[PDB]
Amino acid sequence: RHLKPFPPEFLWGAASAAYQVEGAWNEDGKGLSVWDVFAKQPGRTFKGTNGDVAVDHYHRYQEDVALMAEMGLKAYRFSVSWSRVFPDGNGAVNEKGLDFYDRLIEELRNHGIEPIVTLYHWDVPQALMDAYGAWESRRIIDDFDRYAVTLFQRFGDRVKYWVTLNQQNIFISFGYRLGLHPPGVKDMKRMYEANHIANLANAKVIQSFRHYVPDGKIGPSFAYSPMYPYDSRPENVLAFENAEEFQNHWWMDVYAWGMYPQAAWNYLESQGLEPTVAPGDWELLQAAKPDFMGVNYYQTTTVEHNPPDGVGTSSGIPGLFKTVRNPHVDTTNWDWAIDPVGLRIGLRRIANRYQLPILITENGLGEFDTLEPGDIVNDDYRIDYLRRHVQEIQRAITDGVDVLGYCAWSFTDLLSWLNGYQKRYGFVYVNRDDESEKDLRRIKKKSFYWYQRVIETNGAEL
């Protein structure tokens, strides 16, 4: 079987998120985000780590882009911090905030790197939470649209690729069901209402994008764990049907088709959990087709039958499914599956169901890297993980999936939302830890040079 090459304009990328890298949390007129406030609540984050400084990319962006150019990155995906642009979410635009992203975009373009702008990575301005509960109010649809249009107007001439909501399923479920992320709520009814409003906000911004960036490409990015049945027991295959629909189609069908899947809807309706639908909602959701599906991928999930008095280790929904360890894949040191074939499966499923091109917006390995004498980081484990995923992407392309690019997570080490700094993801080590910022110096890991060679050969040497 001859494999197809990676296409000539394949976006070999790397990625970050604003709160995780920028720092400068109160500089240049930036307003408070919900994460600025949440992470300072005692006990919320490991060792009290927060984004006040992070890795200081706000001040060190020129050095970081110089490293990207040394690597030969074709694309860099970053998020814009809404609270830098509209400190209060709505109201007056902050020109100094826009100017940072203008300088970053110019730095990228001057080095031949395609910017991929992510509108939203979980950091809605605290003022919108204070005023109306942020994602629980339809008011956010127009406020988010005004913010997005501002970015489209300022940067649409120079940015072709845009991501709207990044991992909506995570920020909504962690914020409103698990209570782990802002606003720290544990209420499924509120979760599904906020989720519906986020769906409308995504659709509204895509419609606006067609007016302001007619030659651009836009899509949401979904945190996709493809589901597997444990085996060929009919009840386990049925559990897989339930899980793939409830965990995955629930989001991606809205993004692609503007419709929630019916079995999941009817289940929520039987629990009194389905969202409130207003006139015009379906019309808007259906009339906002994206150019691609963004995919954040780390692992698959295997499921089995879960009786109605069952699991609510394993997690699941009684009567629908429960998770079970997959005996046929390796695991990371944090019990995450390592399943590169699962990435090919997920790509195939998206092409098969929606016929959409895919931008892989995030994939990477987190591990406790050691800085050895001479400023050397031997992260062969990260090379092995990335190599295997890139190989499976090439097989998915050969199968016929249109993959637009691959953004490794992450370019530099960064702050995790709740777990501090020690589990590192970067190609570039940042010298700091949970106790202090040290000197924040950037140190290329072995994986940096491996990926440099991948890009130079367009994937022929992995």
Ligand X SMILES: O=P(O)(O)OC[C@H]1O[C@@H](O[C@H]2[C@H](O)[C@@H](O)[C@H](O)O[C@@H]2CO)[C@H](O)[C@@H](O)[C@@H]1O
Ligand Y SMILES: O=P(O)(O)OC[C@H]1O[C@@H](O)[C@H](O)[C@@H](O)[C@@H]1O
Please report, as ranges, the residues that interact with ligand Y according to CB under 6 A. Answer: 17, 20, 167, 170, 296, 362, 366, 416, 419, 423
Burial of residue 312 (number of CB atoms within 10 Å: 0-12, 13-18, 19+):
exposed
Tokens 């092995």 sit at which residue?
384
Cβ distance to its own copies smaller for residue 391 or 419? 391
- The token pair at 170 is 């995570």
The answer to the question of residue 137 lying near ligand X (CB under 6 A) is: no
Minimum Å distance from CB 425 to ligand Y? 6
Among the listed ranges 139-147, 415-423, 442-450, 453-461, the one in contact with ligand X (CB under 6 A) is 415-423
Minimum Å distance from CB 230 to ligand X? 20
Choosing among its own copies, ligand Y, ligand X, none, which partner's interface includes residue 233 (Cβ < 5 to 8 Å by kind)? Answer: its own copies
The answer to the question of residue 416 lying near ligand X (CB under 6 A) is: yes
Cα distance between residue 405 and residue 205, in whole Å:
23
Is the CB of residue 285 less than 8 Å from the CB of residue 251?
A: no
List the one residue from 216, 342, 357, 426 that touches its own copies (CB under 8 A): 342
Site map 371..410 versus its own copies, x via CB under 8 A: ----------------------------xxx---------
Show contacts with its own copies in window 226-245 (CB under 8 A).
228-235, 237-238, 241, 245
Minimum Å distance from CB 333 to ligand Y? 11
Choosing among ligand Y, its own copies, ligand X, none, which partner's interface includes residue 216 (Cβ < 5 to 8 Å by kind)? Answer: none
Minimum Å distance from CB 423 to ligand X? 5
Cβ distance to ligand X smaller for residue 94 or 296? 296
List the one residue from 139, 146, 423, 446 that touches ligand X (CB under 6 A): 423
Minimum Å distance from CB 323 to ligand Y? 17
Contacts of 401 (CB under 8 A, 6+ apart): 347, 348, 350, 351, 358
Cα distance between residue 301 and residue 240, in whole Å:
10
Q: How far is CA 27 from the centre of its chain?
A: 25
Cβ distance to ligand X smaller for residue 93 or 178? 178
DSSP state of 68: H
DSSP state of 48: G
- The token pair at 118 is 């992510």
Cα distance between residue 65 and residue 60, in whole Å:
9
Minimum Å distance from CB 354 to ligand X? 19
Cα distance between residue 300 and residue 280, in whole Å:
36
Backbone region of residue 59 per phi and psi (left: phi > 0; alpha: psi in -120 to 50; beta: other values): alpha
Residue 88's φ and ψ, nearest 5 degrees, are: -100, 10
The answer to the question of residue 351 lying near its own copies (CB under 8 A) is: yes
Containing H/E element for 270?
helix 262-270
Choosing among ligand Y, its own copies, ligand X, none, which partner's interface includes residue 405 (Cβ < 5 to 8 Å by kind)? Answer: none
DSSP state of 275: P
Is the CB of residue 200 less than 8 Å from the CB of residue 146?
A: no
Interface with its own copies (CB under 8 A): 1, 228-235, 237-238, 241, 245, 249, 259, 261-263, 265-267, 270, 300, 302, 308, 319, 326-329, 339, 341-342, 344-345, 348-349, 351-353, 355, 399-401
